[PDB]
Design a protein around this ligand. Structure first.
Ligand SMILES: [Ca+2]
Ligand SMILES: [Ca+2]
Ligand SMILES: [Ca+2]
Ligand SMILES: [Ca+2]
Lengths: 701, 701
């Protein structure tokens, strides 16, 4: 049981002599202000860095950090830059660790240069006591384990003041943002359940659904593949049409508008909440610019350029990153294209005879998700290498550029198959008179029969649930925390949340119960992150932060892109605009009767291109003469046959007009939601006004 | 010649006794810190308010206001909140007037309550000396008259430090913004002249222009009016087609993109320039919130609601303002509709026989501009009355709400005829088989023959030049400034500049030399505003300001609306998308030959509706059987005649797709221009860093 002390570093004790000299030179600089104690356990030494009482005001004044006062107006104690009070244990462990880390970073041979050189293996603070220990005494770690880091306390609120008090305000800000996201997902999940129940309660009487599942019509569709498969009855796929209505009803369009407004309201609710937490924790912006130490490779680079005496190199690095992003996009496209074929071969190998084209698609999206998880680490390493060779000036810019590059790579390799299936999947394929052949021998495949909106939503389901699947399916203190996993950072924990937010905002024009899945994921992910921070990972160094930072701009950009993505999803891949066009232009009775016969276009089977027709035309029991495809083209009994008709141009014009109306009106409503809701709450403003006039009154006398 | 003194107020000296008692009560409160001297000239007294030396540090410390320091690092003197230096005339006239006005506003019976009550006619400062006076001694007013307020010094730069030193920093900020606007209009004007010369150098060989001005084709167009006029040859209007190419060439589309980027660049340049001027003048944000005195009607309202013991009343006021704005819109539409008819009757009264339909349109837009100038004051008074009955809490919110209401009313009544001619002018009229009749007897008019883009640009020309036309076509001091016109405010001077900016950004997709007209207007308007501020108007009270305020948000909103307005102008009223559609879909040779025959649609003259055909079908010398209109409809020799064909839907789909592409790409490029250009300049940041570390170093010792 070590005494009350602070951040400790780990040495390498058995060139080696130069490393030992560098390991001993800095403690000689630490003699004046840091106490030390060495320890041997079996073969490797370690050192301790307890700091003394008079040096806490020495560093707490040069770096301005807040301190609670004595007076309590309205039973709420005020704060000040420094207050001197006896029984000096009021400096909690996070403040002491921050002061010691600032001492380590300021004193040169910074501690990061010695850690990257290799003379120091690690430098971590120690957790206060132990969690779930026998006969422990009022531990903050134990309190956070029993009240916050438990699966049986998931419904209760989280002690955000306690997690700020223990793991600092960056981890506190992350958990407050995650709690705000989880709390805002509840009304979206409720409305999503309502919309899904509306879809389930209407699909029985949905007129296209009954027209497409009806027998005695005997409509024979076009083969949709090469000479391997053949003509298929449309009714044989209309069970997909029963699943199709649950995702493209007008309630889903209202749901898209509601989630645009919900993303806006969440953005300014978090904008107010971060100012509320800034009022609660620290409003001092005295941490001024150009105070962090520069990078040692940056120092070497500037020494080199002053000896040999930039923007061009940084522009070249950004260009290389741009072709890297384009390569990632085309790589994701080709990975999805080969993964669906690999799943098709795997399912056709033992002749399972599913005859549903859903289990094979689930296998395809599962192996695609596996490959995406495999290349996520590759893209992270590529982004880190690209950012390190640019050698930014400070650590903050280094972290922000690494964050930007990693987020763009995660965005492209996590949304490339979904953007491929949603938009560029079965539109560029031509008429059955003549198809388009990529590499002059392979046809570009059409999507799922009866509508690949079902394919899009099951890919969304599997990819969103895969993140849940991969997570759900005599000794002294210093060696115990040495056995613990080191703390990496909040950046990969923000990455998955931002990707989930992209799923929630970008693709609920096709999946109304995505907020429900996101809420069910976040409910257990809050407790998993709590258990990981309390039990497994080492104590974070509690770096000071004011707001979230770059991820707020990332959320704003995702929300702005979600408007145009949702508009394009509703217009093009949702098959809702053609229903409106048939209802208001071609109905002739005011009802949606004959919509399926209007959408389908005839094709004479004598006009295939060089044996593309199937080898078995008698599989249906009759010799079919005309198949029906879906492209809005002229019938074969016309003067200009297999040509684009007026209906295609009318439907396309209506789709583009709806994109214009949706995008403009939804951006205007989001701007109105931004304008109405103030950034600063009125109560926080009157409280900070009262606090500043009360401190002026107190310091007047 | 009065001595060195400050702001003086004007009394009413011959109930009257109560007014006299209120006029004498407040000078008794002025005895302690203000000196006074009374003066009679013929019948009315006046008072003087020279302030004493010890009161200047008393008020200059409670309200933190700038004071130059003695030391000059890099030949630039620093700034501190207060410095004590002998020869106390370093406090210039604007600071003394501001201190005296703050004294007047703080001391109760505020000075605005006594001025609105009626006991005080005016309260104005005196100009330092006189301009252009004989044997004057280094006057700032004289220096600004010969160096800034003159028409012979228009090419030189303006002394922005001197105008800040004399009329304060609000007038300085207005003149700096006007100078930045004039300087940024120069490259836009150069590119506009280049684009206009490109249009002039191509119109000779423009294939639609030669096809439309060619003889021997003998195309007879539809009557385009009621039974009054008759069929007209298209060539008889193709001189308008020679003017039409100068405004809808592809250089104009590139010009629209260039002005979107130019508006973004101007916004970021002014954003940097206002921070530069903030560094030069004052960076202190110590003027905290809730320090201004509340309104007396607001005090009466809160006293009433506390005695009798809001959001509903404010919402009702905003609703009344919304129906007021809608009424202004429909009023502007009907004013244009009756003004064109009034001009037509006025021109047809003496039988001028112009036969050009341009002089009558110029008369229509001139009288429309006259009516708009007439109702601008009406809308300003309506906005002031609507804002005053809402009784806002402070003066700043009162001015901002009055500004918002006045700007919306100015926007609607200044852009309603232009938005009417651009978009809703000749599109809702039907085919010549059957027209639409408003009020069941009057046809909705078609616009000018050969293209009403010419009508739109001549209306833009006249409305933009009308603001230039209405502007170009033994005694002591206190009585001299009493004879001068009182200072109203910078709000009406900002209104015309914002309307000019709306003209520059919203409508250069149809008028490429609008920045040239704006530059030629601003060149003389800077000098007229300078002469008005120096010679005619009284001295402003020099209220402190940091940025412009609401007008920056207004400029941002105008620039954001300009993207979609320009996209709709290029797609719908520019006739550029149909040229692209004919070139890439119907050309059959790759050239623009037969475009006029493709756009025009035939109509049999046997199919007019109830005598709508003209009374004189033999005016052209032949009995015409088929006229040609412009609606993309099926020919009469068709199974479905006079019906919308495939070409209309294709052209409409291309127009909407171009609106989508233009809006999305142009907003992305504007966001990229905002993102690349930093808000704070790097040199200003390094200088404020150097200044703060040097003041820390000085105050350390
Ligand atoms: Ca996590
Ligand atoms: Ca807001
Ligand atoms: Ca003016
Ligand atoms: Ca910027």
């Amino acid at each position: 049981m070590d005494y009350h002390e602070d951040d400790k570093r780990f040495r390498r004790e058995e060139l080696c002599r130069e490393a030992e000299f560098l390991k001993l030179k800095m403690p000689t600089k630490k003699v004046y202000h840091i106490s030390e104690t060495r320890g041997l356990l079996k073969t490797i030494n370690s050192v301790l860095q307890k700091i003394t009482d008079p040096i806490q005001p020495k560093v707490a004044e040069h770096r301005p950090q807040t301190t609670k006062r004595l007076s309590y107006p309205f039973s709420r104690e005020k704060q000040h830059l420094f207050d001197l009070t006896d029984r000096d244990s009021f400096f909690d462990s996070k403040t002491r660790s921050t002061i010691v880390y600032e001492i380590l970073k300021r004193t040169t041979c910074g501690i990061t240069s010695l850690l990257a050189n290799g003379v120091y293996s690690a430098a971590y603070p120690l957790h206060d006591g132990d969690y779930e220990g026998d006969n422990v005494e009022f531990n903050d770690r134990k309190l956070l384990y029993e009240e916050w880091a438990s699966y049986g306390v998931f419904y209760k609120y989280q002690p955000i003041d306690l997690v700020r008090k223990y793991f600092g305000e960056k981890v506190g800000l992350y958990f407050a943002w995650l709690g705000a996201y989880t709390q805002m997902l509840i009304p979206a999940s409720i409305v999503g359940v309502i919309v899904f129940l509306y879809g389930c309660a209407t699909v029985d009487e949905n007129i296209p659904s009954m027209e497409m599942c009806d027998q005695r019509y005997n409509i024979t569709m076009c083969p949709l593949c090469d000479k391997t498969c053949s003509y298929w009855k449309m009714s044989s796929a209309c069970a997909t049409a029963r699943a199709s209505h649950l995702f493209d009803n007008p309630a889903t369009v209202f749901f898209s508008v509601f989630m645009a407004l919900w993303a806006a309201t969440f953005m300014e609710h978090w904008k107010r909440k971060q100012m509320r937490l800034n009022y609660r924790w620290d409003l001092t912006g005295f941490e001024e610019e150009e105070e962090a130490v520069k990078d040692h490779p940056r120092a070497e680079y500037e020494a080199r350029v002053l000896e040999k005496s930039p923007a061009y190199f940084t522009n070249l690095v950004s260009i290389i990153f741009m072709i890297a992003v384009t390569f990632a996009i085309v790589l994701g496209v080709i990975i999805y294209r080969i993964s669906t074929a690999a799943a098709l071969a795997m399912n056709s190998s033992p002749s399972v005879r599913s005859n549903i084209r859903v289990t094979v698609t689930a296998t395809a999206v599962i192996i695609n998700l596996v490959v995406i998880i495999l290349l996520d680490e590759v893209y992270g390493c590529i982004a880190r290498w690209l950012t390190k060779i640019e050698v930014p000036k400070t650590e903050k810019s280094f972290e922000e550029r690494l964050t930007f590059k990693a987020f763009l790579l995660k965005f492209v390799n996590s949304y490339t198959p979904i953007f491929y299936v949603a938009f560029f999947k079965g539109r560029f394929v031509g008429r059955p008179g003549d198809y388009v052949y990529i590499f002059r021998s392979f046809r570009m495949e059409e999507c799922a029969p009866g509508g690949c909106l079902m394919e899009l939503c099951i890919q969304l389901s599997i990819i969103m649930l895969g993140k849940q699947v991969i997570q759900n399916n005599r000794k002294q203190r210093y060696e115990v925390d040495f056995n613990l996993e080191p703390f990496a950072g909040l950046t990969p924990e923000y990455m998955e949340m931002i990707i989930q937010f992209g799923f929630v905002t970008l693709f609920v024009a096709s999946f109304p119960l995505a907020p429900l899945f996101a809420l069910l994921n976040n409910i257990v992910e809050i407790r998993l992150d709590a258990k990981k921070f309390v039990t497994e990972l080492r104590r974070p160094v509690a770096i000071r932060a004011k707001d979230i930072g770059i991820w707020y701009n990332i959320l704003r950009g995702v929300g702005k892109l979600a408007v145009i993505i949702n508009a394009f999803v509703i217009s093009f891949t949702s098959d809702f605009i053609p229903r409106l066009v048939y209802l208001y232009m071609y109905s002739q009775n005011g009802t949606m009767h004959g919509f399926v016969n209007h959408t389908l276009s005839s094709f004479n089977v004598s006009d295939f291109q060089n044996g593309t027709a199937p080898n078995d035309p008698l599989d249906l029991g009759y010799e079919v003469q005309i198949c029906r495809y879906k492209d809005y083209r002229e019938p074969p009994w016309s003067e200009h046959k297999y040509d684009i008709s007026k209906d295609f141009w009318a439907v396309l014009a209506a789709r583009l007009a709806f994109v214009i109306v949706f995008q403009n009106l939804v951006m205007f409503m989001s701007d109105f939601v931004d304008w109405v809701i103030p950034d600063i709450p009125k109560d926080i403003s009157q409280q900070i006004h009262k606090e500043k006039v009360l401190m002026v009154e107190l310091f007047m006398r």
